[PDB]
Amino acid sequence: MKLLVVSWGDFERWKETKYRFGGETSVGPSTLPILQKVIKPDWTVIVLSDTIGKDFSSVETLREDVRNRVMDFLDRIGAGREVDVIIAPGIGEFTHGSFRGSAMDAYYYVLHALSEIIPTKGDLEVHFDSTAGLNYVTLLTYRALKDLLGIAAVMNTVTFYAYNSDPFVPKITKELNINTIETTMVKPTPLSEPLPGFDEYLCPYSMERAEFVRLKGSLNTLKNLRKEKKKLEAWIGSLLFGLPLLFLEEFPDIGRLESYIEELAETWGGAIAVNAEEKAVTRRLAFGSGFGTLVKLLFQARITRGLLVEEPYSIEKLYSVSDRLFRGSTLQRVRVELGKIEDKAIKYARKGAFPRDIPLRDFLGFDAANREVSPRNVLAHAGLEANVVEVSMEAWEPKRPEEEAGRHTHLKYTPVGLKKVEDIVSRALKES
Amino acid sequence: MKLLVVSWGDFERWKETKYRFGGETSVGPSTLPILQKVIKPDWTVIVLSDTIGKDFSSVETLREDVRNRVMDFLDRIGAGREVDVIIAPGIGEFTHGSFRGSAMDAYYYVLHALSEIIPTKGDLEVHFDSTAGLNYVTLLTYRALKDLLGIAAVMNTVTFYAYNSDPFVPKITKELNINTIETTMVKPTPLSEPLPGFDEYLCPYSMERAEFVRLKGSLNTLKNLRKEKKKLEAWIGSLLFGLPLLFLEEFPDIGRLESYIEELAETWGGAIAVNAEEKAVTRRLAFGSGFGTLVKLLFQARITRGLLVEEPYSIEKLYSVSDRLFRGSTLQRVRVELGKIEDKAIKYARKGAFPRDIPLRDFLGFDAANREVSPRNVLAHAGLEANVVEVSMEAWEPKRPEEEAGRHTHLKYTPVGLKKVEDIVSRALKESH
Numbered sequence: 001m002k003l004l005v006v007s008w009g010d011f012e013r014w015k016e017t018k019y020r021f022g023g024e025t026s027v028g029p030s031t032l033p034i035l036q037k038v039i040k041p042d043w044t045v046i047v048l049s050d051t052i053g054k055d056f057s058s059v060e061t062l063r064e065d066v067r068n069r070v071m072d073f074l075d076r077i078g079a080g081r082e083v084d085v086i087i088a089p090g091i092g093e094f095t096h097g098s099f100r101g102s103a104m105d106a107y108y109y110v111l112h113a114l115s116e117i118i119p120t121k122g123d124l125e126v127h128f129d130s131t132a133g134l135n136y137v138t139l140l141t142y143r144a145l146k147d148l149l150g151i152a153a154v155m156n157t158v159t160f161y162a163y164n165s166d167p168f169v170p171k172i173t174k175e176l177n178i179n180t181i182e183t184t185m186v187k188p189t190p191l192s193e194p195l196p197g198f199d200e201y202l203c204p205y206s207m208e209r210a211e212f213v214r215l216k217g218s219l220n221t222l223k224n225l226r227k228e229k230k231k232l233e234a235w236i237g238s239l240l241f242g243l244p245l246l247f248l249e250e251f252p253d254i255g256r257l258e259s260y261i262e263e264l265a266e267t268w269g270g271a272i273a274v275n276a277e278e279k280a281v282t283r284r285l286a287f288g289s290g291f292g293t294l295v296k297l298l299f300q301a302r303i304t305r306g307l308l309v310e311e312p313y314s315i316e317k318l319y320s321v322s323d324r325l326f327r328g329s330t331l332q333r334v335r336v337e338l339g340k341i342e343d344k345a346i347k348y349a350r351k352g353a354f355p356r357d358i359p360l361r362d363f364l365g366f367d368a369a370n371r372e373v374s375p376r377n378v379l380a381h382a383g384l385e386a387n388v389v390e391v392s393m394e395a396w397e398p399k400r401p402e403e404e405a406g407r408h409t410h411l412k413y414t415p416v417g418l419k420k421v422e423d424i425v426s427r428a429l430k431e432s
Numbered sequence: 433m434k435l436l437v438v439s440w441g442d443f444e445r446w447k448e449t450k451y452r453f454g455g456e457t458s459v460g461p462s463t464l465p466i467l468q469k470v471i472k473p474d475w476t477v478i479v480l481s482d483t484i485g486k487d488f489s490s491v492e493t494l495r496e497d498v499r500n501r502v503m504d505f506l507d508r509i510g511a512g513r514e515v516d517v518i519i520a521p522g523i524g525e526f527t528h529g530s531f532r533g534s535a536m537d538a539y540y541y542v543l544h545a546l547s548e549i550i551p552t553k554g555d556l557e558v559h560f561d562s563t564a565g566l567n568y569v570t571l572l573t574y575r576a577l578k579d580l581l582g583i584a585a586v587m588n589t590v591t592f593y594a595y596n597s598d599p600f601v602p603k604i605t606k607e608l609n610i611n612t613i614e615t616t617m618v619k620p621t622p623l624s625e626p627l628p629g630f631d632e633y634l635c636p637y638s639m640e641r642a643e644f645v646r647l648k649g650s651l652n653t654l655k656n657l658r659k660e661k662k663k664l665e666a667w668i669g670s671l672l673f674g675l676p677l678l679f680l681e682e683f684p685d686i687g688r689l690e691s692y693i694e695e696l697a698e699t700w701g702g703a704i705a706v707n708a709e710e711k712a713v714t715r716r717l718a719f720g721s722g723f724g725t726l727v728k729l730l731f732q733a734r735i736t737r738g739l740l741v742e743e744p745y746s747i748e749k750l751y752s753v754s755d756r757l758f759r760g761s762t763l764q765r766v767r768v769e770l771g772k773i774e775d776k777a778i779k780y781a782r783k784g785a786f787p788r789d790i791p792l793r794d795f796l797g798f799d800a801a802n803r804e805v806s807p808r809n810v811l812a813h814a815g816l817e818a819n820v821v822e823v824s825m826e827a828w829e830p831k832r833p834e835e836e837a838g839r840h841t842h843l844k845y846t847p848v849g850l851k852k853v854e855d856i857v858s859r860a861l862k863e864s865h
Binding site: 328329 | 483523524525526527535536539562564565566567568570571572574575594596598599601604605606608611612613614617619624672673674675759760761762763764765767768807808809811812814860864865
């Protein structure tokens, strides 16, 4: 699947020029038609600053005003029907209006917007154009793309192209070339930051501090994160450190993450005070890093949802999850640890023995007085530490145990063990 | 160490305005004087395009032109002279003259330039003002800064701040606020690229086939890299996969990497045709990704050169190297592997036994089952695979051998062992890309 993204400033004040790109030529005010013509995108996204709005009645008469003038322009140069448009929150004092707010809201807004468009299944070929965009909007849009595709790269092949044209110089330009400024195969980068303090999800831009404490207290999101924060950091750690059984057991509720994000989103949007007479939007709530972390966490969850196998969690299923999720030494470490437990299950099967609800220490046959759960042993043994894991073998009539044992040998964390692992992994993620 | 880096466009065309930053206020045409006042950087770097130069008599006259113009502006505004000016290869046909070449030259030039500027010892706090640079020069400066800081973060703490001002609309403007658009604790990202094929170091932009073939064929880099490629890729893999003994044994020659980058950078610079009459600059060679990989490899080597020691490698040394290079589960697996070998050395020592030049398999007491060297065991056992490592216990008189064995037990790859690990790790580095 191929995707095209472009960063747009004031698209109206653009003069007609011709553009060269990939053995093609085109005449018009923007690069979008020839980009589309050559690249053949399966889908297109346009990112605009909302600072090109004129009708200040309220928020939906601004995002309307801006969408109107865009959707006119996209029929003028035939940009087709497969398109999404992102009206990102800009700031500054303009001719026909003033916009006030945190500069970083555009990143979090575009990150949020892109997280719902980018496909979470199959390989991705992303094309990005910085030609006719604001400096910071193009910069934050580029960062937001790379941050999400980095997480997409975990499960799928991701190739990223960036373009800027020769500088349009109005009094000598005859034509302009679409230069490829980047061609990169995106590295798999799993989410590697903890959820922050309940300070940094929404922050007051221009809201009196008493009013903030009031609204912060009414959010069901921040109260529900208090409970789940540690369970989610444990899941983040599962991918980063190569802990496949913890990945499955701590797999987050997507419906629940969707609802947290929407509540922080519609709370932010509902703190935007439009003044129809002064011609002044004011975004009184600013998105924090915590909003960014949640959006990335939900995206990583959508990307890897195919791997949440039906219980019970057998050695064979853990191998299968591990093969897709992990690379390099991490994968090989995990395969060796599952191999140890598998080889023991085989030995048992051969003797016609099927231990059920046995601690992993007793399954592997361990010395006593080594029952303290160390960070070292949890992280070094792919989260399959002997004091926190319980094994069961469903009894069967074996014929070739070396093949059968993998399917019939199930692992889970003890309720005590799972909390020790959560604490260890959560702390390891914070110390990073 | 604090580093301020500013991406600049046509700085002479800017209007005087007012600037708000960190409580302080500033009247002037540039953000730099207030940025310096507030941030108090130890060093400042200015990144601007070639296309501002108005002289085509030579390539060096073109750069002393741009530098002089920059130096005059730093006098005009209340700016310090403690700075480095990176005059990047820019593209497009202008009124005062013409500049043609690969657009990606600016990335590789700035990457190379910053690689020689950004300190390779101590922590870094980097501030990046994109307040009024060009789109594509600012993107490629941002890209190159991150790519190097990511390698820096392996050995040191690195914090990154990015700024951009309120957009300027004429007269309406009274005071533009300088906003923080990014604050990031930079993640450790060791180089995870193999060295590419010998087509991808220098490519011909505007050059006849045979003239290029001659230049390419004249390069000592491409000749030597052919034979060194596997060892350098084995070293890259050592940081990425958590192989502390391979890191030491395969530590690259910084002198030779310096030599390769200088040669490719000289060839590039020499292939710039500057036509004085018709006011034209053609960069007849383009930089390839292979140049970028080499610049990053030398930077990572510089960043980590402080860990290198002489040939006897003790388990204690492998512990201390590992605790600097590695993190999370990678670090913990390496410590478990060193632990198994250490604990075996402690057992040998209590018996008053001190084996020398013995295979690790014989040291650990393995079956005759598996002699074949698999990727699985090399990567899973932090490169300390039983069929490729040789152990030597320096003879001593133990009293507390639990603390003593680490210093007196030395590991090294067999000459056959090392080539097998190079193949696997090189192959694993190329398969992960």
